[PDB]
Structure 1
Amino acid sequence: KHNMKAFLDELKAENIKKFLYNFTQIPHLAGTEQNFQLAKQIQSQWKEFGLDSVELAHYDVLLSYPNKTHPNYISIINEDGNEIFNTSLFEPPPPGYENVSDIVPPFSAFSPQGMPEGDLVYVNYARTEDFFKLERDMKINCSGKIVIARYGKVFRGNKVKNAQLAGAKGVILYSDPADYFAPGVKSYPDGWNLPGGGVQRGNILNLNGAGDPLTPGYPANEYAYRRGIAEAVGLPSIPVHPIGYYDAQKLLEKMGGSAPPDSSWRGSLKVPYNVGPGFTGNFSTQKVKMHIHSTNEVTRIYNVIGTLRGAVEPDRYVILGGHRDSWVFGGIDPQSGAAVVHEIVRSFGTLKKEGWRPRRTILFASWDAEEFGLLGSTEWAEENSRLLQERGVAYINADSSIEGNYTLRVDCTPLMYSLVHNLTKELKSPDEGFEGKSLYESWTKKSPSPEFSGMPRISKLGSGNDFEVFFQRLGIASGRARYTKNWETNKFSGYPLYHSVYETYELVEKFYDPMFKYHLTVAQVRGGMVFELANSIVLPFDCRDYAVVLRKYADKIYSISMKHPQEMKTYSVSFDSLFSAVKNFTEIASKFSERLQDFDKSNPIVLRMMNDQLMFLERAFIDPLGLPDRPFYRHVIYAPSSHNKYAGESFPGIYDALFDIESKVDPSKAWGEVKRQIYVAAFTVQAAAETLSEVA
């Protein structure tokens, strides 16, 4: 039989391993020849594997690269102008790769050029609350200072925005061992820890969903009219550069001024973690000088788009997408994901060669330039937005398959919760001690839901990956799954070798998943989801799961507002409309679910009508006007946090209107905007509910 079991059984750990090796021998930086060659290889193989069509979709987007003959570095300079200490020009390459060409040195993509010189201020993680502590409690002014911040906790782009708004004239990002060196584990190549010379690459844009900085709203095609650089979206205004902890220790060790305000500001290096500004007495006339010469250049990128046409509903699309471009070798990010997508395509193709087709069309994507701001996925979605919003059933992301080896991680829309629970009950656990038990059982034991006994944790989608356009701009049901580390010891900074040269095939094969069993499990989850979405007669979405979370989110936002009882009285701030909308949603969803299981099974129009109601439910949460000053974040329930792009925020319009409201000079205006956002949210919830009512 051609059923899900046939699909899942065809997936092989050994194939995933072979593909990962194949994808990680040379760098595949976006916009480079080697990443174009890999695109062409993937296109050719997907055709061989049996897809109906496989095309490249190219765009010309703004990218950023160091200058090969004018390297980026940071100095400590003395009062004479002599550079007495210089940061490294490159990470020491790992064993057997010391002759590999075209390893991009560490840099912060999209940094402007400059050679600012000044006194350091240490700003912890450069979070909003870190800057509050500096400016409001400690009275330290970052204006005209070079800030040094440790990576971790939030997306690095947010750190840069925060530093820029504090008046910094440059930013130095570094990896502290407190956040990137797990105790008792050896540095690469002898274990999975970050060495002192290791450096995390990564873009520092604040795009808010825009895609290519020069073409917001429209694809960067061959006739596109581009913004000038001065009107581009999301570019930082001050130079930024990342360093390792050997070099950071040399910058931090001389710091003077105020002591750290408490132990949450101290990392693990043998330095005091003084805030500054500037150095202690003997070194007070020394300064820090950045030298950044990177350039921004419009560069061609290539997405591979494979189609497996549906037998019954070819105008309904289920999308499995993940990126191909990497900072260097991409051993985990993204090729551990891409290898999984490759094996999923191979398996689906094996069924297709035997005469099977899915009910709905499946689209497979290998995205480019994800590392430079989700550019390839977003430009393609901009080009195809009309097709996607009328025909898009679901988007399953497929970046890194592993960030640890402890248990499963799933982030998705509530519409997929039931699907994920049911699928994981039918999959085998790969975990030690759970032989013969389901993945649902091991996952639930290791990552219990904070709210329901006997259920696993599923998180909100944040951002920082290629699902963003699909979910928060277009309102297509989206999800992601991978293996992760223990949620208890999880400090929200990722794996130590993230975006480092040390992220290699050997890292994965030696230290993460030698048998490729966690990769296989992730392939079964991502592939099983795509299979069920593309083949189930009734779309596998449960609207009642949205009703439950909406009440939880309404309770949460009300509880934030209720810290200001006087103001709620003065300005007559009521959440009654939102709770009423949520109650209505709950009632209407329950009645829709009854019809979905009571409806005449033999009637395909009632079926297609009900499937369209399910499909367009996520879509109903889109507000075409967007969120305030973030026109491409249109989902009213979920947006990336304004303080941390990686984190999802619920009722973001209301949350941002309430945030730090006690510091606003015009409380009448501020609370008026809270009330406006309550109205928008209540209306949107009710409108969404009404899409599930009887249609006439």
Structure 2
Amino acid sequence: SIRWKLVSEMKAENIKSFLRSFTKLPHLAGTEQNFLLAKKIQTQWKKFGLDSAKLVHYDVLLSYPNETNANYISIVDEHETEIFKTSLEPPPDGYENVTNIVPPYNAFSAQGMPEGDLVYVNYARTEDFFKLEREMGINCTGKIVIARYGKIFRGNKVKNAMLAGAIGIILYSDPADYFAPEVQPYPKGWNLPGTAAQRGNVLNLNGAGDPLTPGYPAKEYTFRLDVEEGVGIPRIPVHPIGYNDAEILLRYLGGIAPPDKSWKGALNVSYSIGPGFTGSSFRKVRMHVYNINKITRIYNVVGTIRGSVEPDRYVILGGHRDSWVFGAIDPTSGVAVLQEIARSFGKLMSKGWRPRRTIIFASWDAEEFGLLGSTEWAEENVKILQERSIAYINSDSSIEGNYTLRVDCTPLLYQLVYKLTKEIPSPDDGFESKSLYESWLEKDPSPENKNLPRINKLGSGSDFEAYFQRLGIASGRARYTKNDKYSSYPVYHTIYETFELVEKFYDPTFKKQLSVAQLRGALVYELVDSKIIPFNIQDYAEALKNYAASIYNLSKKHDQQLTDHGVSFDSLFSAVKNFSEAASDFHKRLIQVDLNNPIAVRMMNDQLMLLERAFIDPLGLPGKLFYRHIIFAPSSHNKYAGESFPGIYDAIFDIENKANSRLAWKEVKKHISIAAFTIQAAAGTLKEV
């Protein structure tokens, strides 16, 4: 009943009004406007009747362009004359009086003015650089590389380019990846204009949080690394340009033809690889990048509704509010959703309801600079969060497309997600009498089971990362997305993410955003109020069987080497079998618990709460102290994607090219052994005696 009142109280029109109110001005992390927005959210939470709503600050390293030394890329001739220089642009229609839009840049780029020959490196993925070096005869050492955005997180591209020896990397938005067919560019449609460039940071933090204070919250007194030693800071310049400018740089590239169609984007240029130019005054490319890194105060808003029975157990509903410009999709659509969820919980409170456990609401700052606000607060509060948290539900963008739902969560949460989506009306045209679960199932069926909707593994990409990958708190993300060959959505991280874009092109009725609010809010409600925490551990058992089969299958091409080096997956399969038995027995006992015996209920709830924690190894993964989950990690090739059995996967990846096979296969054996132990230990936490 109460769940229905929570869901039914939420209104599309309220989400619309919140979104309009938060998207009139830019709200970049570390700027006065994003502090004002924090205070507005805080005022609203107090009005809604939350028990607390406080600003919690940190002083973390941020990065901004230098207003008096603007960044650019140029082409010079052999006489050092600048022949072309990249450029810039007015605010979107209606925003003419907005004066502090940050120009395009890649936060945390190194400073410098490298000059050299240009080489096109496709998406700058690991496989693209392998191809260049191993198949194409191209040496990127000492070159400036140009890569198209898309497919993977941009910091991975920069890491890859550094490894390949490039001295600078230019990123651009190819219309193949950011221009949907038969749609007009903004403002007439929702596509990316050729003058616009995508902002975004290019760190490789691997879960560290503020670069200067890995492991510990960035308080006033806190020891800071020297900036030159900041974690994840790239060592070459990086800058983004739009496709009009990229076309000019790519047009006269010479050398080898593109190797196959998968390397050719959509511009009217050959997509030859370089190095060097042909057919032109075009002689060398230069970058000039002089962004400033500076310690800057950021502010989270953290509020609570204290539990009436288990105040020392938490469900976290957290979403970022900092944007690159107006951020009407990212994150402000999620900011509006979070406010409407908080308002609805306040309405329940007004009629005398209080949750069983405690809800923590959080509006995070500086997500765009490396998940900084959410990570520093996890670092501050780790001791209470790791011993008391039930789950983390994110509230970043709600409306990245208008096709269907996309959910990423731990297997613990699959059952609850499917249950709740069955009870929320579908917002989709043609599904007027059906549930969200029904439309989602039709539009995105699971590859492993055709009669369930797809749910993806957690890697990174938003503020749940430290909660799940470092602390082992069950996490979930849900939002509307596209069906569509473009990456993200066309105007992602540009000036064109405006309220008008969302209202006109994405979700005019706000019904799709409403459905996402209802699901996020209902997840928090069931996790915080149910007497027995609504996880299912047998779904985790089945997931482990799938992951074990997958990593074993990846090893088959090396079967002879497994034999010769005495590598076996037997202990991993044995642990998975033992875990399946323990999970079955646990659920058999759980249905017998005496619901009227509070300590009996609390003991089994502690087993449900602590199961995800069992997968966290304090030693971390190789080279990555802050990714500690043995079953999942963000991919080392693309932090946006989750990878299963990451220690094993990274040990076996490209193993045939390792210099020392005996050493390489011993590392595979190491990670197989760690994974077998960790699963067996997790199974041990479920045992009755």
1:575-600 C-alpha deviation (Å, 9 max, x unpaired): 00000000111011001001111222
Return the letter of the residue paired with 1:345: A
For 1:63 and 1:116, the matched residues in 2 are separated by 23
Q: How many Å apart are 1:74 and its aligned residue?
A: 0.7
Q: Is the contact made by 2:252 and 2:279 (CA closer than 8 Å) also made in structure 1?
A: no
1:136 equivalent to 2:127? Answer: no
How far apart are the structure 1 equivalents of 2:314 and 2:280?
Answer: 66
1:457 alignment counterpart: 454
The answer to whether structure 1 residue 70 and structure 2 residue 69 are counterparts is: yes
Q: Given that residues 557 and 651 in structure 1 are in contact (C-alpha distance below 8 angstroms), is that contact kept between their aligned partners in structure 2?
A: yes
CA distance in 1, matches of 2:69, 2:97: 21
Q: 2:500 aligns with which of 506, 521, 527?
A: 506
Corresponding position of 2:393: 396
Q: Deviations over 1:523-561 (max 9, x none)?
A: 011001000000111001000000001010000101111
- SS of 1:598's partner is coil
Is 1:435–2:466 an aligned residue pair?
no
C-alpha distance 353-37 of structure 1, shift in aligned 2 (>3 A): same
SS at match of 1:633: coil
Which residue of 568, 573, 590 corresponds with 2:567? 573
Rounded Cα–Cα distance in structure 1 between residues aligned with 2:366 and 2:279 = 46
Deviation string for 1:640-696 (max 9, x for gaps)? 0000000000000000000000001110110000000000000000000110110x3
Q: Which amino acid aligns with 1:607?
A: V
Distance 1:115 1:505 in 2: 37
Structure 2 residue 603 is matched with structure 1 residue 609: yes
Q: 2:378 aligns with which of 373, 378, 381?
A: 381
Contact 1:430/1:517 (8 A) holds in 2: yes
Residue 14 of structure 1: aligned partner: 13
1:682 aligns with 2:676: yes
The aligned counterpart of 1:280 is 278
> 1:230 & 1:112 partners in 2: Cα distance?
10
Alpha-carbon offset, residue 562 of structure 1 = 1.2
Separation in 2, partners of 1:269, 1:7? 49
Q: CA-to-partner distance for each residue in 1:122-147, whole Å, 9 max, x for gaps? A: 00000000000001111111111000
Q: Is the 8 A contact 1:321 1:395 kept in 2?
A: yes
Q: Offset at 1:98?
A: 2.5
1:94 is aligned, of 84, 92, 95, to 92
Look up the SS of the partner of 2:492 in the other structure.
Answer: coil
Structure 1 residue 348 and structure 2 residue 342: aligned? no
- Please, which of 535, 541, 544 is the counterpart of residue 541 of structure 1? 535
2:31 equivalent in structure 1: 32
1:330 and 2:324 correspond:
no
Cα deviations by residue, 1:491-545 (Å, 9 ceiling, x for unpaired): 5x11000000000000000000011000100001100100000011100100000
Give me the whole-angstrom Cα distance separating, in 1, the residues matched to 2:443 and 2:381: 40
Q: 1:627 aligns with which of 621, 645, 667?
A: 621
How far the C-alpha of 1:84 sits from its partner, in A, is: 1.2
Task: Report the Cα offset of residue 169 of structure 1.
Answer: 0.4
Question: How far apart are the structure 2 equivalents of 1:295 and 1:239?
Answer: 12
1:52 aligns with 2:46: no
Structure 2 counterpart of 1:414, which letter? P
Task: Tell me what 1:115 maps to.
Answer: 113
SS of the equivalent of 1:172 reads strand
Is the CA contact 2:177–2:485 (under 8 Å) kept in the aligned structure 1?
no
Provide structure 2 residue ranges, at least 5 long, that are not aligned to the other structure: none
Secondary structure (helix, strand or coil) at the match of 1:480 reads strand
Distance 1:615 1:262 in 2: 50
Instruction: Kindly indicate whether the alpha-carbon contact (under 8 Å) linking 2:338 and 2:517 is maintained by their aligned counterparts in 1.
Output: yes
Given the two structures, how large is their TM-score scaled by the length of structure 1?
A: 0.98
> Secondary structure, in 3 states, of the residue corresponding to 2:192?
coil
| 2:413 partner letter | M
Which 10-residue stretch deviates more, 204-213 or 97-106?
Answer: 97-106
Structure 1 gaps of 5+ residues are: none
TM-score when normalising by structure 2: 0.99
CA deviations over 1:324-361 (Å, ceiling 9, x no partner): 10000011000000000000000001111221101110
The corresponding residue for 2:647 is 653
Question: Contact conserved, 1:91 with 1:501, CA < 8 A, in 2?
Answer: no
1: distance between equivalents of 2:584 and 2:130? Answer: 45
Runs of 4+ in structure 1 over 2 Å off: 90-93, 281-284
Q: How does 1:119-518 map to 2 (within 5 A)?
A: 119-280=117-278, 282-283=280-281, 286-486=283-483, 489-491=484-486, 493-518=487-512
Amino acid in structure 1 at the alignment position of 2:594:
D
In the alignment, which of 539, 549, 559 is matched to residue 555 of structure 1?
549
Distance in 1, matches of 2:124 and 2:482, equals 25
SS at match of 1:672: helix
> Aligned partners of 1:450 and 1:60: how far apart in 2?
44
Whole-angstrom CA distance in 2 between matches of 1:93 and 1:140: 41
Whole-angstrom CA distance in 2 between matches of 1:38 and 1:599: 46
Query: Aligned partner of 1:41: which letter?
Result: K
Q: What is the total number of aligned residue pairs between the two structures?
A: 689
Deviation by residue 1:388-443 (Cα, 9 ceiling, x = unmatched): 00001100001000111111110000000000010011111111111111111111
Question: Is the 8 Å Cα contact of residues 91 and 106 (structure 1) preserved in structure 2?
Answer: no
Deviates more, 1:551-560 or 1:95-104: 95-104
Q: Equivalent residue of 1:384, what SS?
A: helix
CA contact (8 A) 1:254 1:283 kept: no
Q: Secondary structure at the match of 2:338?
A: helix
Aligned partner of 1:134: which letter? Answer: L
Match for 1:463: what amino acid?
S
Q: For 2:290, what is the secondary structure of its paired residue?
A: coil
Provide the C-alpha distance between the structure 2 equivalents of 1:83 and 1:364, rounded to a whole number of angstroms: 52
1:366-398: CA deviation from partner (whole Å, max 9, x where unpaired) = 000000000000000000000100001100001
Contact 1:112 1:295 in 2 (8 A): no
Q: Take 1:356 and 1:433, find their aligned partners in 2: how far apart are those partners?
A: 36
Q: Name 2:665's counterpart in structure 1.
A: 671
- The answer to whether the 8 Å contact 1:539/1:614 transfers is yes
* Partner Cα separation in structure 1 for residue 37 and residue 645 of structure 2: 41
Q: Return the offset for 1:453.
A: 2.5
Q: Is the 8 A contact 2:83 2:281 kept in 1?
A: no
Please state whether the residue corresponding to 1:45 is helix, strand or coil: helix
SS at match of 1:274: coil
Residue 240 of structure 1 deviates from its aligned partner by: 0.4
Provide the C-alpha distance between the structure 2 equivalents of 1:474 and 1:490, rounded to a whole number of angstroms.
Answer: 35
Match of 1:428, SS state, is coil
Task: Write the deviation string for residues 285-337 of structure 1: whole angstroms up to 9, x where unpaired.
Answer: x1111111111000000000010001111100000000010000011000000
| Distance verdict in 2 for CA 1:225–1:604, change over 3 Å | same
Preserved contact between residue 115 and residue 290 of structure 1 (Cα < 8 Å): yes
Is the 2:207–2:626 contact (alpha carbons within 8 Å) kept by the matching residues of 1? Answer: yes
Equivalent-residue separation in structure 1 for 2:349 and 2:279 (angstroms) = 73
Give the secondary structure class of the aligned counterpart of 1:364: strand
Instruction: Letter of the 1:297 partner, please give it.
Output: K
SS in 1 for 2:596: coil
**Cα displacement (A) at 1:91:** 3.4
Task: Give the distance between the partners of 1:409 and 1:293, measured in 2 at CA.
Answer: 38
- Contact in 2 for aligned 1:92/1:197 (Cα 8 Å): no
**Superposition RMSD in Å:** 0.8
